[PDB]
Write a protein that binds this ligand. Sequence first.
Ligand SMILES: Cc1ccccc1Nc1nc(N2CCNCC2)nc2c(NCC3CC3)ncnc12
Ligand SMILES: Cc1ccccc1Nc1nc(N2CCNCC2)nc2c(NCC3CC3)ncnc12
Lengths: 297, 301
Amino acid sequence: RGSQILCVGLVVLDVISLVDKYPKEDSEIRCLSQRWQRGGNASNSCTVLSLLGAPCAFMGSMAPGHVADFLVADFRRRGVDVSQVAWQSKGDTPSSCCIINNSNGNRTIVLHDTSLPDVSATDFEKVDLTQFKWIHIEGRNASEQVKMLQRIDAHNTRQPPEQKIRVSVEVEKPREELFQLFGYGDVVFVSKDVAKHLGFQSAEEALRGLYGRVRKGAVLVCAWAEEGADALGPDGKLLHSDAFPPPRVVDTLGAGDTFNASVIFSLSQGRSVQEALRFGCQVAGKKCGLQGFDGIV
Amino acid sequence: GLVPRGSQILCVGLVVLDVISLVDKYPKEDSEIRCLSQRWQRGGNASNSCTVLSLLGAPCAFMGSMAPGHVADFLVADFRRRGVDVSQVAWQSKGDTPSSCCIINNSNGNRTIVLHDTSLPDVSATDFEKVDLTQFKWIHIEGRNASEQVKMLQRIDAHNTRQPPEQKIRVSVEVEKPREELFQLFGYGDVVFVSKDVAKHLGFQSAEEALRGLYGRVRKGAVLVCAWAEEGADALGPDGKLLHSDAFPPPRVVDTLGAGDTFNASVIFSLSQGRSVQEALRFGCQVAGKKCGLQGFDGIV
Ligand SMILES: Cc1ccccc1Nc1nc(N2CCNCC2)nc2c(NCC3CC3)ncnc12
Ligand SMILES: Cc1ccccc1Nc1nc(N2CCNCC2)nc2c(NCC3CC3)ncnc12
């Protein structure tokens, strides 16, 4: 069957305040405007995949309430298949305050991480893999997710190399539990932040450094903000793309997630890595000159 | 439902959703962090006063602007959680329901605040024209859009004219922000609360200075009231006698957000039960002092 891309990670309620300068501690400013957004990484990518025309599904934990009710209404307005959601009985829907600096698009996030339990190999074991051509996993609970990945590798072995499910991993946080995911998946996304918190000061360094850790045959991608992004495949040849900066950067909240969704969409449509990188930077760049996600397509 | 004539106390003003985050350290711009804890709270001066009026046992209503949406839903259910009648809300078709973001540093205590946008339209005098006043024994107004609020106050004067002294609606006004627009509001109301912040911005350095210095601006026969945190609160009436009450410090101070509103509501309450101004200053101070030792409004009983 396999027409859908699945993203596994967080859905968070983003309570957003657009200010024109980042307030100095102990001071007080008035925001230009405010809004609510369905956020969290896997969730954001689903938004982006949807907008690009790719049928997709989200999978993460949500706790029933008025909050979950809004997040789902939004998922459904987008056409994001939520049927894979691991509903919880104990815990709250995470949320966060996001101050977005309108003069330069900087975004500052205060996350309220609830009790809410992550999805587990248990919940995942319960999933119909034959619906998906691509599966992307937001690194969080490594122990449990590695399990999930193996269930997919093991599912690929019993498949025509034609009908194999493509797998991508994001390692966005500098915490060590996650460095095992490097690891699995055809495509591995590592953030500038991780890369720096590990000694590296350029996208090309990070890639020469970390290529050691990836499933043989994998592509490692590392974006570097206004500097574009680089990728490195089995052949050893470094690939680069210049960023596409909008003329006014006004909102970079979910720029990384836009990059990733875009890279995945492109690879999932047959494109070269070079083309998918370029496209990643192109949509990310365009989103930086917009409030939210509407208007990138 | 049916509200018995002359039974409710109405507070007009702001309701806002405050999202309050406690953090290890103040986050550097463009960073992502995890707060120690986060809380969603209904706030705003007329808003907090209602909560307290309800907890004190007074039927009370809130009048302010909201826009349909999920923030309004949370604020409305919070009002209801506190027994506040929201049937007088002025629902708006344009703008955001006010939402403030508030960041508290756990390792030095400072508060950083992103204030709600200014997009939602205040309640106008023409909205106020539409309200049947007979349900109210007292109307309290948090000064915001004074040009318009003056009209509302003039309407209440009109109404009181055709009424026996025992169906006249008492009126209180609150000037809490140092803005020229607001000062005309001194001229209206039987009771006028001026905040410590306003008094200082005008150069006064105590409750006594402020009361002595501003009483000139209130209408004949009005009482002017100035609370001053740990120094207690003063009041000055037509008879020229300055009245005072000391503060009642709690065993330990925990949460002073909304203490000014707790005081306001408590004085209003006491006056409305027929108590003397002196008895009501005291009570205002007792209640606001108890509230200072408590998280939120819960245990103020
Ligand atoms: C290419 C990419 C990958 C992953 C995340 C974001 C991006 N793109 C950009 N991120 C940021 N970031 C996110 C990281 N913090 C800084 C802003 N800034 C820009 C930018 N800024 C305008 C430059 C001043 C000319 N122009 C184009 N693309 C991006
Ligand atoms: C009486 C009153 C009217 C209006 C607003 C507040 C109050 N009461 C108090 N405010 C503050 N404020 C609120 C404003 N920031 C400073 C503390 N501190 C205290 C306090 N502290 C105990 C220490 C012995 C003095 N004890 C009793 N009442 C109040």
